[PDB]
């Protein structure tokens, strides 16, 4: 019997409302639930929530059209949400999870209040990038005051900037913010080695590295994907470049085969001497970004990889050894970057297979995070059954929900061929008003 996906969708929104029942009823306002407990958690500020996960889940619902939802999130961003805070707040999770989210929102509302914050919180981040001579943003600043702390950064988190504050610039008129997303990641392509190379540690206040560690993976990541979607996004020819010229430089020096399989271990960013066996689940969000940059059949043989661990393991595995193929860890953070992979890869050519391989997943996240009040983390994928941990992270309301919903429902709310997402799945582009 085919899959119904029009069915299928409308079980991912009914699972994504009754979600949202549970933050509502248990963690109205707070950061993340705890939904084993019934409990919430702070996230960037202990004791000073910042209303994450209802700011992260404001795009889902309005894609699924879940609008009373949505509309009682908004509500409560414009009466409560406020950033003059005396705390450290992290640069990086706070522009694509805050920055991103409200901005997101704005787009599918229109309401001119979500980009007033967006925009505010933007502007108190915008002092970690001006405490560099480099403009490498430092990885904490205080909301209130400015004050930085911590400038031993990553490619990461200097360069997942550009879509957000891009966004930011065209919205307002005020280059400021494209400039500074861009000119940080200039500074570490202007530093790539003679074979393509940049390591993923970066010093705000040198401007040197400080590992010989080039990566795909975590730390170094969406540094990538925000070259192609600068491109994509604002029509930057030079991140055009930049987002190919790198990808190839990868592709000649990190993929590696072991077991018959692909994998991108990290490696010394001058010689290319492998320095590293492991590789992390967030990884497979390149597999998408390699069939972005038009290097599809790549990224399939990367997706094989990942679906590969999922048909093992049922739950992908938190990090690997790529040279067994084996779990180096057992818990898990209910990680979104399979869905992620499908979806961008299925916006290609619309291929039914990256449909069949999300719906092994979202099935296999009901049948293993499913708890009282949501949808939690795992503490451990080799019992039967996983045993679970107490946390529902605040991107699984901006990610996998919505990577489901947009893969199965055909929704009339998105333009698919428009359609742009953020690291955090903050849809950037591609909104059908109703
Ligand atoms: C620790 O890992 C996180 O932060 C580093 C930077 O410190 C990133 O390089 C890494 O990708 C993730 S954030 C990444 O994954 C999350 C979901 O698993 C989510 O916030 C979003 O997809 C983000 O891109
Ligand atoms: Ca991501
Ligand atoms: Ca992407
Ligand atoms: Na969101």
Avoid at 270 to 293: D, I, P
Avoid at 392 to 397: A, S
Wanted: glycine fraction near 8%; proline fraction near 3%; charge should be negative.
């Amino acid at each position: 019997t085919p899959e119904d996906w029009k069915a299928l969708a409308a079980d991912v929104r009914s699972e994504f409302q009754w979600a949202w029942q549970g933050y509502v009823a248990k963690a109205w306002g707070k950061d993340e639930i705890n939904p084993v407990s019934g409990t919430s958690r702070s996230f960037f500020i202990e004791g000073h929530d910042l209303g994450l996960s209802l700011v992260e889940a404001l795009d889902t619902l309005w894609i699924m059209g879940l609008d009373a939802e949505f509309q009682a999130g908004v509500d409560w961003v414009k009466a409560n949400l406020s950033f003059d805070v005396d705390g450290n707040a992290q640069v990086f999770e706070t522009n694509i999870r805050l920055v991103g989210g409200l901005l997101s929102a704005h787009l599918a509302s229109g309401d001119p209040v979500l980009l007033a914050k967006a925009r505010d919180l933007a502007d108190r981040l915008a002092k970690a990038f001006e405490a560099s001579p480099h403009g490498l943003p430092w990885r904490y600043v205080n909301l209130r005051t400015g004050a930085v702390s911590d400038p031993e950064t990553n490619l990461a988190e200097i360069g997942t900037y550009l879509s957000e504050f891009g966004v930011l610039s065209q919205l307002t008129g005020e280059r400021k913010y494209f400039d500074m997303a861009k000119r940080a990641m200039r500074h570490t392509l202007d530093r790539r080695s003679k074979i393509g190379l940049m390591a993923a540690n970066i010093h705000a206040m040198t401007g040197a590295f400080t590992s010989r560690n080039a990566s795909i993976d975590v730390y170094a990541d969406s540094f990538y994907e925000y070259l192609w979607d600068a491109w994509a996004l604002f029509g930057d020819e030079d991140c055009k470049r930049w987002a190919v010229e790198c990808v190839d430089a990868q592709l000649a020096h990190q993929a590696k085969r072991y077991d018959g399989r692909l994998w991108f271990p990290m490696v010394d960013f001058e010689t290319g001497a492998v320095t590293g066996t492991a590789q992390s689940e967030l990884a497979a969000y390149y597999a998408g970004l390699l069939g972005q940059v038009g290097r599809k059949a790549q990224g399939d043989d990367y997706l094989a990889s990942f679906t590969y661990l999922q048909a093992t393991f049922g739950v992908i595995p938190e990090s690997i050894d790529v040279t067994t193929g084996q779990p180096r860890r057992k818990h898990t953070g209910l990680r979104p970057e399979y869905p992620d992979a499908c979806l961008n890869l299925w916006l290609i050519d619309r291929d039914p297979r990256y449909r069949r391989l999300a719906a092994i997943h979202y099935r296999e996240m009901k049948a293993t995070s499913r708890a009282a009040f949501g949808y939690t983390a795992l503490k451990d994928i080799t019992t039967r059954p996983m045993t679970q941990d107490d946390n529902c992270p605040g991107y699984w309301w901006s990610e996998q929900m919505k990577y489901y919903y947009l893969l199965f429902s055909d929704t009339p709310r998105i333009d698919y061929g428009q359609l742009q997402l953020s690291t955090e799945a903050n849809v950037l582009r591609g909104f059908r008003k109703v």
